[PDB]
Amino acid sequence: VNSFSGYLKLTDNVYIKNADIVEEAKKVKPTVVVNAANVYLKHGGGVAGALNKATNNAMQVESDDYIATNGPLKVGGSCVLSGHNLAKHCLHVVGPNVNKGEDIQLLKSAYENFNQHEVLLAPLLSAGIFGADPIHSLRVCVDTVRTNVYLAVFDKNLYDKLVSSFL
Ligand SMILES: O=C(O)[C@H]1C[C@H](O)CN1c1ncnc2[nH]ccc12
User: Which residues form a coiled coil?
Assistant: First the structure.
């Protein structure tokens, strides 16, 4: 039993809700919140810009030190950093950004990072400003993640479409 509330159960391990991931994290304080990161951990817009703003830019400060030490992530890769005031940890995961020409096949590799964590609060990778089809992202999530994932979909219209079209 965990403290997530109001989610629709899609499969044995995937749950979905129309919610602002920032407000959800603040309420639940999950062990792991997933950020929709880029390889430079430059948290400018979308989910990443929103999470970082909620940390008063502390996420960006920590991220800049991470990059200065380690260099950029790989597309499809991840790193674990602090969750600041939002969660214990933040798993920064880089899905392919179609608006950059990146291979959508890397979306499965991106979701594989979730399997290293027993429970996560997450967005749909590569959706929104990353330019992929969210219906496809949800399908890859369900077919790749085996740990317990609580998906927050900001757009209510999109949430309704994601639910109605789920196979
Ligand atoms: O449009 C949406 O609903 C999704 C898809 C996109 O990739 C990011 N976005 C979000 N999802 C959940 N919480 C969020 N807080 C701020 C933005 C946001």
Answer: none
**Token pair in block for residue 118:** 């027993």
Which residue, judged by its Cα, is nearest atom 16 of ligand 1?
A: 47
Run of H or E including 35: strand 32-36
Count of beta carbons in the 10 Å neighbourhood of residue 81: 18
How was this structure obtained? X-ray
Q: Which residue among 7, 15, 21, 53 has the greatest number of ligand 1 atoms within 8 angstroms of its CB, and so is best to mutate?
A: 21
Domains of the chain: 8-163 (3.40.220.10)
What is the β-pairing status of strands 89-93 and 78-82? Answer: antiparallel
**CA 7 to centroid of ligand 1, rounded, Å:** 16
Resolution of the solved structure (Å): 1.0
Instruction: Give counts: helices (H), strands (E), the chain.
Output: 6, 7
* 3 state DSSP class of 86: coil
Compute, in angstroms, the gap from residue 160 CA to the centroid of ligand 1: 14
Largest separation between any pair of C-alpha atoms in the chain: 45
